[PDB]
Amino acid sequence: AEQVAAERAARKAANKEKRAIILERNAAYQKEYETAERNIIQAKRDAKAAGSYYVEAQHKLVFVVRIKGINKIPPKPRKVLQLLRLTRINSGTFVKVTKATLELLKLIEPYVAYGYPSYSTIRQLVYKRGFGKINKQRVPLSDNAIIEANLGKYGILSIDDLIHEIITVGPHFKQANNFLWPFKLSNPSGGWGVPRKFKHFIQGGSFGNREEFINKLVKSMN
């Protein structure tokens, strides 16, 4: 009476319940993303028609990549790179924008490329290079149940729940972002552009704020 035929079926029914919830969550998130972006486009249009200027809300998320190697770093940038968990070259981390962290990003400015990531790059980063931290031990995601086993207390059920909590900086961004292992990115597949990396992007190099060109960069590195 080991009840394999009914234990497997009850577990399958629970699996289908969870998948129904995940499906309706993702449909709600897709409608939310679409109405947010169309409302920003229409707000720009309506301000131009009124003669106003629509100023966008300032960006709340940057994606930081350490672009300089390990040797010859001064101790205060070295400490801040460890604190942002950028401990090797082409490491990446999502960063919530506050004053308390925009002054970290000014200290580590010659050693990192950052900017504002789009939904396409967050989606591709988390599907391809997304790893959790589970007793710590760097576990690949590849399953919604293992995401739910550590982030279900925060109401994060699936990988797209994780992506949504990253991109809309929710109340559990800190937990969802510290659960992700720092992204281990390759070199950019086309190159950096820029014959010399270690200038500012404004000055024709790589480091600093490259506000929305970080999407092109990280898609080449991913």
């Binding site: 707000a43 301000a47 003669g51 106003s52 200027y53 629509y54 100023v55 966008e56 809300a57 300032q58 960006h59 709340k60 924008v97 506050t98 004053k99 308390a100 962290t101």
Partner: protein, 159 residues
């Protein structure tokens, strides 16, 4: 040879702060210090008794002892690769209260007050401080504000 006396390199530290020489005002002597209060150290140059060493200028510590005219202050001092507790015997004209411990105590009282109005109704009032946030969406009008500015300026010497 070399010189490392008690008040060496104190030409400007113990100077008396232009047009504020002479007698010490009396609120300095009527402030009350309890054991555990957090005090700042700034030596008055005009009182030579109870005077802290020059290391302790700008240092902030805790009152552990209260005496006839003086308080004892715990100061943490970085000796080599660790911190040592130093006990200081400073008269109260070299001592002032920290304004940070005022500001934190009105934040404690504000936290208790808003937690009381959250207990009255409306729980989860979100009573931690937050860093400065990125600004939200504005609409900027062009009403008496048509954007009109010229270019960079030519070089002239004006000498």
């Amino acid at each position: 040879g070399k010189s490392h006396g008690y008040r060496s390199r104190t030409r400007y530290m113990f100077q008396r702060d232009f047009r504020k020489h002479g007698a010490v005002h009396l609120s300095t002597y009527l402030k009350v210090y309890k054991v555990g209060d957090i005090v700042d150290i700034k030596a008055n140059g005009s009182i030579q008794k109870g005077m802290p060493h020059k290391f302790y200028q700008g240092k902030t510590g805790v009152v552990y002892n209260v005496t006839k005219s003086s308080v004892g202050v715990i100061i943490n001092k970085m000796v080599g690769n660790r911190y040592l507790e130093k006990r200081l015997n400073l008269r109260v004209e070299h001592i002032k209260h920290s304004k940070c411990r005022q500001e934190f105590l009105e934040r404690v009282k504000a936290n208790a007050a808003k937690r009381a109005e959250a207990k009255a109704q409306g729980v989860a009032v979100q009573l931690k401080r937050q860093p400065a946030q990125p600004r939200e969406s504005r609409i900027v009008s062009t009403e008496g504000n048509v954007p009109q500015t010229l270019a960079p300026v030519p070089y002239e010497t004006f000498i």
